[PDB]
Structures are given as structure tokens and as C-alpha cells.
Amino acid sequence: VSTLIPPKVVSSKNIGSAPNAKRIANVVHFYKSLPQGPAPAIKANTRLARYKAKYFDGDNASGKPLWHFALGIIAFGYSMEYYFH
Amino acid sequence: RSVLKNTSVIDKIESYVKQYKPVKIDASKQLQVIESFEKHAMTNAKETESLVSKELKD
Secondary structure, rough: HHHHHHHHOOOOOOOHHHHHHHHHHHHHHHHOOOOOOOOOOOOOOOOHHHHHHHOOOOOOOOHHHHHHHHHHHHHHHHHHHHHOO | OOOOOOOHHHHHHHHHHOOOOOOOOOOOOOOHHHHHHHHHHHHHHHHHHHHHHHHHOO
């Protein structure tokens, strides 16, 4: 009966659809992400932290300090042998 | 007219047509509701245009 008008009804359409929820998720997801590996805190020491940073990161990740811990029990219990028997 | 040699009505119907030679004026009546239609058009259009011009760069 007249010139009907759905070319411009986008302004209040852009809430209900599914990429709108993904869009408002990931524009929030992107800003607080640190850019290029920044603030990783690669240097730390608390009298036991260099042990962790040298041994217990994902780079080395070897169980040989447990060996040393086992050696520590060889340092401990055998000396407890010297304290008991 | 001169084809009919027994004319008798051609002056009558000719002056009847020349009588109704001002037939009827046209209808340029819409200048108030049509501007409201294009007002809603420009409204929703500039809403859409500003929103997409923001969200493209966003």
C-alpha cells in the first residue's frame, strides 16, 4: 500500500542474534590479554624460588630433583641410621 | 464534424467537451503524512548508518 521499510531496522536488531553474544564476549576477551608475553615475571627469588625456576618449570620439567629429594632422604634417613643404629 | 452532414449534435457534444475541458485538478494532497514516512525513514536510516559506521571501526 506504500513503500515498506526494512533496510534500516538494524539499530535495534543487533541484540538478539547469536554473533552479537559472541561479539560482546570476545571484545571483552581481547583487551586485557597481555600482548607479547609481557609481565611473565621471569626473575623471582624467595630462598626456594630459584630451585623452582631452574627445575620445576615446563621447560626442564625433569623429576631428577625428586632424585635429589630421594638423595635428601638418603641424606636424612641414613643419617638417622647414624642416630639410631 | 463535416463528415456528418446531418450534424445536429456535434456542436452540442463539442461544447460539452469544451465545457468539461477543465476536467478536474490532480491530487497533490500528501505533504504531511508522506514527510512523516520519510521522517521515520531518515530516523531509522541515520540510526543504522551511525551504528554501522561506529561498529565497522570497532
